[PDB]
Amino acid sequence: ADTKEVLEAREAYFKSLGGSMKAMTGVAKAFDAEAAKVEAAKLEKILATDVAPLFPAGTSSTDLPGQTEAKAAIWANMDDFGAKGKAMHEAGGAVIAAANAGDGAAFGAALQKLGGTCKACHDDYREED
Numbered sequence: 001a002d003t004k005e006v007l008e009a010r011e012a013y014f015k016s017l018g019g020s021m022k023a024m025t026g027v028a029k030a031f032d033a034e035a036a037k038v039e040a041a042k043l044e045k046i047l048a049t050d051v052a053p054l055f056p057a058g059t060s061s062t063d064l065p066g067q068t069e070a071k072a073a074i075w076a077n078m079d080d081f082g083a084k085g086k087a088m089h090e091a092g093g094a095v096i097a098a099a100n101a102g103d104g105a106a107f108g109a110a111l112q113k114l115g116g117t118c119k120a121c122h123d124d125y126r127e128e129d
């Protein structure tokens, strides 16, 4: 697809994740198993997205100044970038299971683990200022 659509797709994917992280953070603060499962259901849908095809070479912030925050570095570290995405999917599965187990403590713990995967990747691959 055109750069405009992959950029569109990956932007929507990440916005959805951000909204999910935000909502689950609030649930973790005041655990309600029903709201957790609702959030987990949404996170599950989000994680079904194949994002590898969302980062084709030529879509870094240097190629498309201001259109994206993806750093050119991603393309010099695709194995690490994929690994970090993988870590997120795994952390996500744990958050989903904890929500479904109705386990508030595990949910909060898994959520910390998930947040960490977002940071681990952003630190090396997303544009700050």
Ligand code: HEM
Pocket: 007, 010, 011, 014, 015, 017, 018, 019, 021, 067, 068, 069, 070, 071, 081, 082, 084, 085, 086, 088, 114, 115, 117, 118, 119, 121, 122, 125, 126, 127
């Ligand atoms: C962890 C679950 C996670 C969250 C939360 C998250 C959020 C997020 C947002 C809100 C954006 C900005 C979206 C927008 O344009 O409004 C964003 C952008 C990027 N992310 Fe991220 N992200 C999470 C996880 C990860 C992981 C696991 C990776 C790397 C393996 C990653 C990468 C990126 C990149 C690159 C961007 C820039 C996208 C762009 O501007 O085109 N994120 N993320």
